[PDB]
Design a protein around this nucleic acid. Structure first.
Lengths: 94, 180, 61, 63, 182, 166
RNA sequence: AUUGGAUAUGCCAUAUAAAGCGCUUUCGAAGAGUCGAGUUGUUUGCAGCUCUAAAUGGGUGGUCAUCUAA
RNA sequence: AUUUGACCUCAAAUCAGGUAGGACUACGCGCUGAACUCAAUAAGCGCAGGAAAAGAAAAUAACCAUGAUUCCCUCAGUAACGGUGAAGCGGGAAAAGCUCAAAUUUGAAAUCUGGCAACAUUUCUUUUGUUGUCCGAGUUGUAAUUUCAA
């Protein structure tokens, strides 16, 4: 509204669409690096605590599985990031 | 530990000689580069205009000069700054345009003005940028006639409403999401 | 002197000469980088200085 | 060769028993199932079954 | 008592044959058989890369030809270099892959058997990096790849690929999932 | 390029293959000396991305230091003192055990002509880079002294500036 | 007697090349015992140790904004 | 049998050519560190230069947005902590940007140190190079192209 106070506070000008900055991209999953990550995955295996999570999930005790995963990593977002990845591996193995 | 300033006139003289030596060394070109017009990033100083570090890639491309040759002819380039409004865009664009219009480029190898150069270059003279490109301030509004709908418009009554809307924005934000 | 000029003639145009015949400015200058290898540049920088060198310009007042 | 290494290490221990003693290095629900869970780490897979003594000695004293 | 360097030389060998080896490493000490290996190197002897002297002779010959009065045939040679071979596997341009069995850092070759199997590329593990080095006129070659040959050599190239299949894939095909060593 | 595979494998340090290799290698370095030459780096991908080229002038030394200050910084300082004609380029962790952490340090010979004629490494020959590992100008050195960019990262206070006119 | 940089002038070079700019019918690789968490120590920052990551992910500031570490 | 040749590892040489030490320390960067906030001080230890360090955002901000580092005035004795004590913004001094790893040159290692022989050039018979030839390094990756601004 061209106003100093409000949810759209500030001046009103003609807004310009900024060109895409390449450093914003990092974190993207290229097909080639995804393929290489697949190869190392099938050639290296999984860490010992991953194997315990497989056993925990195959036993269907998900609460303890996420609790110990958070204890191993340190953050809930990392624990969730693990869980979806190893369950995703689970149906692939099945 | 004390820091005394008995070398203040000495420092001032040394800086002036360094400027003088710089001018003598690179006399054909101005001793200060072109700088873009840039607005300070705060509510206390957003009403002013000062000299930024350098132009952006979008401004350089819109003006028609490439980012590679821009450094060579003396146009500093900032790769971090971005233009979020056309008002700043054509503002810096017209700064470059007037710079280029007043700019003369000596041909290299002194054989012919290959594409972008100057045919006659005997009129060389060292002049500061500020004279040709005097950075200005925000345009001060001149007198305008009385607006009738603005006259009916109260003023801070609105600022009270959008304020109350802002403070209790989460209050109704909850209200809709919980009832929906 | 006659011996040293004779030795310099003997070792003229050789890669290695006696440390007495070699120069002695300072140990730091001897260990420093020579101007040739300070001026060495990658082909990338050679192309950059070939195509976009510091131009010669001026402003009309 | 393997017998030679075993004999050499056995001789090494025999001499070290007297000559190189000098060790003395100071000169001024959560349950057993969870215990198994953290019981698997980088050292739990370092299986030592059937390892020779000339390797087990340093593995125990260092690792 | 033997010097410490040769003691460690023998001790590293005994431990490598003593410890429990994961299958990704256990697949390496099982290699190609003798006669197949000789036929492999007999084929590669034909397609060894040209030496520096031969390259220089060719370069000066074409240079003087262009200068005086004036484009050559398609080169045929074995492809070496770890990155170049890996690129060929990625592009599926390679027809046969040979990996030295005794690379010092084993991670440089541990991923290859999985990668060739993923691309369906015939791969084999041959004895000693030195032999591959003499093939490509080098001291050390960690991997060799055959991607193209002449028409008359295509027939026996298919035959040796079948032979290595029989002696490396039809035979074994279990050490990559068997806990080796121990 | 295989270095992508080498890098991705180095990520998973708890893998069975990595665990077996680390134990065997760490055992091997044990009866090796505390500081010993390594003719070829054990992690070529790490060495290349840290600045090591396979040309005459680059030197790789392996050092073991006991655990229990920064071990990486201490490793660089000891190797730099042990090879006094070399400039410490960088260093990287290779292995660890219960008590010994193993590091590989990349060094450059400033006196070698293959280094003095290379414009991409010529900066290290200048005398301002003598004993960077001791002055705290390496990667781990900078991180240990807290050099960074941001609000997170003395003499301006202990002085009382007295101007001419006041 | 040296030089530092330019101007005029002469001779070699070899461009069958290299580079900038507008489009994509395209893909866009980006740093690991590192980040991070718990604990002890030093004046958020750093270090020791247990444990140990991810790839529109990670860091920072109050879903958004800004950066792209090792 | 065993002889011959490779590669790997490790040695030895008064081998060929180089390099490190020690001194100064006012300023600079680290480690360490008391006592009567003292003080991240003094002492002790390591390491450089003509400056050193820092430096081209894993930065501020919440703006119409700023845009590498360093220094000065101001912010300000404010925020913050329990006497200690900033920083953003703003005005100036000075300004300059970049380089790698991560992708095949695969129709060609195109790369580089050293030995030998000439040609040179010099603050200089004392300096620095060029070409040719040989050996070596190097495919466990040297060259060219790419560094996210892309």
């Amino acid at each position: 509204p061209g106003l100093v106070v409000g949810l759209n506070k500030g001046k009103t000008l003609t807004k310009r669409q900024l060109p895409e900055r390449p450093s914003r991209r990092k974190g993207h999953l290229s097909k080639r690096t995804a393929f290489v990550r697949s190869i190392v995955r099938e050639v290296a295996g999984f860490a010992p605590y991953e194997r315990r999570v497989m056993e925990l999930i195959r036993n269907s005790q998900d609460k303890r599985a996420r609790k110990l995963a958070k204890k191993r990593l340190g953050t809930l977002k990392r624990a969730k990031g693990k869980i979806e990845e190893l369950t995703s591996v689970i149906q692939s193995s099945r | 530990y004390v820091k005394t300033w008995f070398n203040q006139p000495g420092r001032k003289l040394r800086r002036r000689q360094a400027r003088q030596t710089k001018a003598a060394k690179i006399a054909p070109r101005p001793v200060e580069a072109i700088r873009p017009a840039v607005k300070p990033p705060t509510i206390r100083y957003n009403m002013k205009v000062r000299a930024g570090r350098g132009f952006t890639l979008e401004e350089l491309k819109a003006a028609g000069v490439s980012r590679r040759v821009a450094s060579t002819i003396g146009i500093p380039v900032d790769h971090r700054r971005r233009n979020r409004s056309e008002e700043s865009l054509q503002r810096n664009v017209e700064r470059i345009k007037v710079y280029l219009a007043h700019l003369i480029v000596f041909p290299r190898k002194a054989g012919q003005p290959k594409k972008g150069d100057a045919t006659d270059v005997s009129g060389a003279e060292q002049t500061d940028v500020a004279a040709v490109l005097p950075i200005t301030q925000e345009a001060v509004e001149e007198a305008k006639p009385i607006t009738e709908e603005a006259k009916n418009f109260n003023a801070f009554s609105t600022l009270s409403n959008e304020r109350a809307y802002a403070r209790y924005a989460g209050a109704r934000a909850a209200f809709q999401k919980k009832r929906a | 002197e006659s011996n040293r000029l004779a030795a310099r003639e003997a070792y003229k145009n050789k890669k290695y000469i006696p440390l007495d015949l070699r120069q002695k400015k300072t140990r730091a200058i001897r260990r420093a980088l020579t101007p040739y290898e300070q001026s060495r540049k990658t082909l990338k920088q050679i192309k950059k200085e070939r195509y976009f060198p510091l131009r010669k310009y001026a402003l009309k007042a | 060769l393997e017998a030679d290494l075993d004999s050499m290490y056995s001789d090494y221990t025999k001499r070290k028993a007297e000559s190189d003693v000098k060790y003395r290095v100071k000169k001024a629900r959560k349950s057993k199932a969870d215990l198994i869970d953290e019981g698997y780490n980088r050292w739990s897979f370092q299986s030592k079954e059937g390892l020779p003594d000339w390797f087990l000695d340093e593995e125990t004293t260092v690792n | 008592k033997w010097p410490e360097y040769i003691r460690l030389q023998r001790r590293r060998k005994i431990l490598n044959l003593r410890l429990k080896v994961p299958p990704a490493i256990a697949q390496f000490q099982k290699t190609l058989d003798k006669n197949t290996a000789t036929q492999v190197f007999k084929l590669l002897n034909k397609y060894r890369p040209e030496t520096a002297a031969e390259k220089k002779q060719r370069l000066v010959a074409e240079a003087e030809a262009v200068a005086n009065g004036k484009v050559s045939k398609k080169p045929y040679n074995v492809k070496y270099g770890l990155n170049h071979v890996v690129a060929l596997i990625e592009a599926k341009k390679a027809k046969l892959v040979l990996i030295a069995s005794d690379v010092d850092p084993i991670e440089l070759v541990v991923f290859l058997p999985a990668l060739c199997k993923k691309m369906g590329v015939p791969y084999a593990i041959v004895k000693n990096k030195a032999r591959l080095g003499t093939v490509i006129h080098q001291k050390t070659a960690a991997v060799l790849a055959v991607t193209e040959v002449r028409e008359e050599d295509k027939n026996e190239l298919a035959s040796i690929v079948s032979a290595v299949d029989a002696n490396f894939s039809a035979k074994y095909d279990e050490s990559r999932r068997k806990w080796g060593g121990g | 390029g295989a270095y992508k595979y080498l890098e991705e494998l180095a990520k998973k340090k708890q893998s069975d293959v990595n665990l077996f290799l680390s134990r065997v290698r760490a055992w091997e370095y044990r009866q090796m000396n505390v500081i010993h030459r390594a003719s070829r780096p054990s992690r070529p991908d790490k060495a290349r991305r840290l600045g090591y080229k396979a040309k005459q002038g680059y030197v790789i030394y392996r050092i073991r230091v006991r655990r229990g200050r920064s071990a990486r910084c201490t490793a660089e300082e000891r190797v730099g003192r042990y090879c006094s004609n070399l400039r410490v380029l960088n260093s990287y962790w290779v292995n660890q055990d219960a008590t010994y952490k193993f590091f590989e340090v990349i060094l450059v010979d400033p006196s070698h002509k293959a280094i003095r004629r290379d414009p991409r490494i010529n900066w290290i020959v200048n005398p301002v880079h003598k004993h960077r590992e001791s002055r705290g100008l390496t990667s781990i050195g900078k991180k240990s002294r807290g050099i960074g960019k941001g609000h997170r990262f003395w003499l301006r206070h202990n002085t009382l500036s007295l101007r001419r006119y006041r």
